[PDB]
């Protein structure tokens, strides 16, 4: 159970974005139905009044929280991967539009899931803004909590992989467009009951064997991190 509070751009806090530049849902409950319209941008997908200005190459940091800013972030039980996708904003997230910019699942070197490291990072993970066409975009940050994912939601709706999905409205101003954004995958649609990484038993299957759901990270993606960029406590 987690939400995005706001974003940072090059280590500068853009301020509380909830219902302003984040298409915030009404609460921190997960989406679990893989065929739900709620898989696009969570349960209240609508245009919000602001879009955060960035340039290509900026570090864009998402900041998550549980109940209040800079708290425990997400229950430690919620082990799983983190991904970020981008789509042009005029799509409203509909159609074959989502391109993956970032994936982090289980780090064998550290012996930790992405969610475990997100807690240590005070809720913060970042991407480099890609060199796509200037214009308005949706950045879809997705945490998948796997503590109940041994079942399919379609078999037992009390269980299933849990999707914490947050869409930020981002405007890319300066970009040379050296990596034009291709068509991508649909949400809902990209994840199905048979997709690798959706049904996974963390109690019985080693995390060293986990394969995160496709699609693979786009060749145009410039990277990211799970690390505290900004100190919310200094404000
Ligand atoms: O026992 C089932 C699993 O519970 C997980 O805890 C979650 C609770 O089930 C859920 O009711 C609670 O929801 C809170 C939410 O955290 C809070 O932010 C909001 O204000 O109210 C909600 C409803 O009361 O969330 C927790 C997770 O934070 C355990 O983490 C898990 O191990 C356990 O299997
Ligand atoms: O962050 C670690 C996670 O990595 C996942 O693999 C993706 C990498 O994160 C991503 O950097 C890489 O990007 C490739 C790109 O696919 C390719 O087209 C381009 O030309 O070169 C890049 C090399 O940096 O993509 C991979 C696959 O999506 C793992 O899936 C995950 O287990 C791990 O935690
Ligand atoms: Cl839960
Ligand atoms: Cu939860």
Curated annotation (Swiss-Prot):
Activity regulation comment: The polyphenol cinnamtannin B1 contained in methanolic extract of Cinnamomum cassia (cinnamon) acts as an inhibitor of catalytic activity.
E.C. designation(s): 1.14.99.56
Cofactor notes: Binds 1 copper ion per subunit.
Subcellular location: Secreted
Processing and modification events after translation: The catalytically essential N-terminal histidine His-1 is post-translationally modified by methylation to prevent protonation of the histidine side chain, and protect the critical active site of the enzyme from oxidative damage.
Organismal lineage: Eukaryota, Fungi, Dikarya, Basidiomycota, Agaricomycotina
Residue numbers binding Cu(2+): 1, 78, 164
Glycosylation sites: 33, 110
Family membership noted in the UniProt record: Belongs to the polysaccharide monooxygenase AA9 family.
Catalytic activity line of the entry: [(1->4)-beta-D-glucosyl]n+m + reduced acceptor + O2 = 4-dehydro-beta-D-glucosyl-[(1->4)-beta-D-glucosyl]n-1 + [(1->4)-beta-D-glucosyl]m + acceptor + H2O
A Gene Ontology BP annotation from the UniProt entry: cellulose catabolic process
An annotated GO cellular component: extracellular region
The keyword Metal-binding is annotated on this UniProt entry: yes
Molecular function, one GO term: monooxygenase activity
InterPro entries per UniProt: AA9, AA9_LPMO
Keyword tags: Carbohydrate metabolism, Cellulose degradation, Copper, Disulfide bond, Glycoprotein, Metal-binding, Methylation, Monooxygenase, Oxidoreductase, Polysaccharide degradation, Secreted, Signal
Residues at which O2 binds: 147, 162
Organism, as annotated: Panus similis (Lentinoid fungus)
Pfam families per the UniProt record, alphabetical: AA9
Superkingdom, natural source: Eukaryota
Disulfide bonds: 41-167
Name this protein carries in UniProt: AA9 family lytic polysaccharide monooxygenase A
Its biological purpose: Lytic polysaccharide monooxygenase (LPMO) that depolymerizes crystalline and amorphous polysaccharides via the oxidation of scissile alpha- or beta-(1-4)-glycosidic bonds, yielding C1 or C4 oxidation product. Catalysis by LPMOs requires the reduction of the active-site copper from Cu(II) to Cu(I) by a reducing agent and H(2)O(2) or O(2) as a cosubstrate. Is able to cleave phosphoric acid swollen cellulose (PASC) in the presence of a reducing agent, yielding a range of cellooligosaccharides dominated by cellobiose and cellotriose.
Gene designation: LPMO9A
Modified residues (Methylhistidine): 1
Cofactor(s) for this UniProt protein: Cu(2+)
UniProt key word rRNA-binding: no
Binding site for (1,4-beta-D-glucosyl)n: 9, 47-48, 58, 67, 129, 140
Use case: Lignocellulose is the most abundant polymeric composite on Earth and is a recalcitrant but promising renewable substrate for industrial biotechnology applications. Together with cellobiose dehydrogenases (CDHs) an enzymatic system capable of oxidative cellulose cleavage is formed, which increases the efficiency of cellulases and put LPMOs at focus of biofuel research.
